[PDB]
Amino acid sequence: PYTIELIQPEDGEAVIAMLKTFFFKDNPLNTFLDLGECKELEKYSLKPLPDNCSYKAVNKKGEIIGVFLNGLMRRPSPDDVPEKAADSCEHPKFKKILSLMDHVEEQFNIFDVYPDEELILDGKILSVDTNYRGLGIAGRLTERAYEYMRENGINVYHVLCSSHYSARVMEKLGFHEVFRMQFADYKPQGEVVFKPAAPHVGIQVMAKEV
Ligand SMILES: CC(C)(COP(=O)(O)OP(=O)(O)OC[C@H]1O[C@@H](n2cnc3c(N)ncnc32)[C@H](O)[C@@H]1OP(=O)(O)O)[C@@H](O)C(=O)NCCC(=O)NCCS
Ligand SMILES: CC(=O)NCCc1ccccc1
């Protein structure tokens, strides 16, 4: 028995404690790189909270057993020159992840798919405690975001998935692929950066219109 609740920035420490236990260790990219201590990922994870559209799953004892951290994303201004997130990162391993994200954004702009949309919901970090996996918590976290979307006239939910494993969960929830890139094809300086196990395949950007 669990609740799905809005995350408050005062929940930050508890959210980070949970992420350090699971996501930091078991996201396919993190575990491949052996991420270790990563204050930059902590910073990254806390950033979307004040947008007031991130959700926690909480068990009967009051412990966080899942999160979906979401932020609002706005269409680039006409005069915008994009910034690389990787430029402001000192952590070498996390910088590789940010560089991959920058590369995806350089190759694919979600706002090109949806020319009429000014604001899109961006699902940034999804993580469920191992002992509570396979119970539909990911879906219930996602469903709470649909409520926020309805309340605010947002039509598109965008989620970058770092493995085919997680893309499949989003597919079950009614998302569809809008962009993909195999890890084997990601060669920013001529050589492969990421080679997790074969079933992960690569990144998939998933979208749903609600
Ligand atoms: C991805 C993740 C959030 C899924 O959350 P979830 O609440 O377990 O989602 P679901 O209940 O829909 O289960 C998804 C699938 O996991 C599998 N599964 C079933 N039991 C499981 C268990 N005990 N442990 C792990 N996976 C299980 C099933 O294939 C299941 O699909 P199905 O129920 O439709 O048959 C979770 O695995 C996770 O935290 N992964 C590591 C962090 C990560 O990569 N986050 C990015 C996600 S985009
Ligand atoms: C929806 C979701 O959880 N995407 C994860 C992307 C990601 C972010 C930071 C480090 C590794 C991987």
UniProtKB/Swiss-Prot annotation:
Pathway: Aromatic compound metabolism; melatonin biosynthesis; melatonin from serotonin: step 1/2. Disulfide bonds: none annotated. Inhibited by long-chain acyl-CoA thioesters, oleoyl-CoA (an analog of acetyl-CoA) and tyrosol (an analog of tyramine). One of its GO terms (cellular component) is nucleus. It comes from the Eukaryota. Disruption phenotype: Has a darker body color. Shows ectopic pigmentation in the wing hinge, the posterior pupal case, leg joints and cuticular sutures. RNAi-mediated knockdown in astrocytes, does not affect numbers of astrocytes present in the brain. Shows normal baseline patterns and amounts of daytime and nighttime sleep, but while awake are less active. Upon overnight mechanical sleep deprivation, results in increased recovery sleep next day. RNAi-mediated knockdown in neurons results in normal patterns of baseline sleep. Shows lower levels of activity while awake during daytime. The record marks N27, S162, S166 as: Has a role in the catalytic activity. GO terms for molecular function: aralkylamine N-acetyltransferase activity; arylamine N-acetyltransferase activity; N-acetyltransferase activity. The keyword Transmembrane does not apply. It catalyses: a 2-arylethylamine + acetyl-CoA = an N-acetyl-2-arylethylamine + CoA + H(+); serotonin + acetyl-CoA = N-acetylserotonin + CoA + H(+); dopamine + acetyl-CoA = N-acetyldopamine + CoA + H(+); tyramine + acetyl-CoA = N-acetyltyramine + CoA + H(+). Residues 126-199 form the N-acetyltransferase domain. It is found in: Cytoplasm; Nucleus. It is an enzyme of class 2 (transferase). Its EC number is 2.3.1.87. Changing D122A: Does not affect catalytic activity. Changing Y186F: No effect on the catalytic activity towards tryptamine. The record marks Y44 as: Might be involved in substrate binding. In the adult, expressed in the midgut portion of the thoracic segments and the frontal half of the abdomen (at protein level). Expressed in the epithelial cell layer facing the lumen of the gut (at protein level). In the brain, expressed in a sub-populations of neurons and astrocytes, and in a set of distinct stripes in the optic lobes (at protein level). Expressed mainly in serotonergic neurons but also in subsets of glutamatergic, GABAergic and cholinergic neurons (at protein level). Optimum temperature is 37 degrees Celsius. Retains 84% of activity when incubated at 4 degrees Celsius for 3 days. Catalyzes N-acetylation of tryptamine, tyramine, dopamine, serotonin and octopamine. In astrocytes, regulates sleep homeostasis by limiting the accumulation of serotonin and dopamine in the brain upon sleep deprivation. Is not essential for sclerotization. Belongs to the acetyltransferase family. AANAT subfamily. This is Arylalkylamine N-acetyltransferase 1. It comes from Drosophila melanogaster.
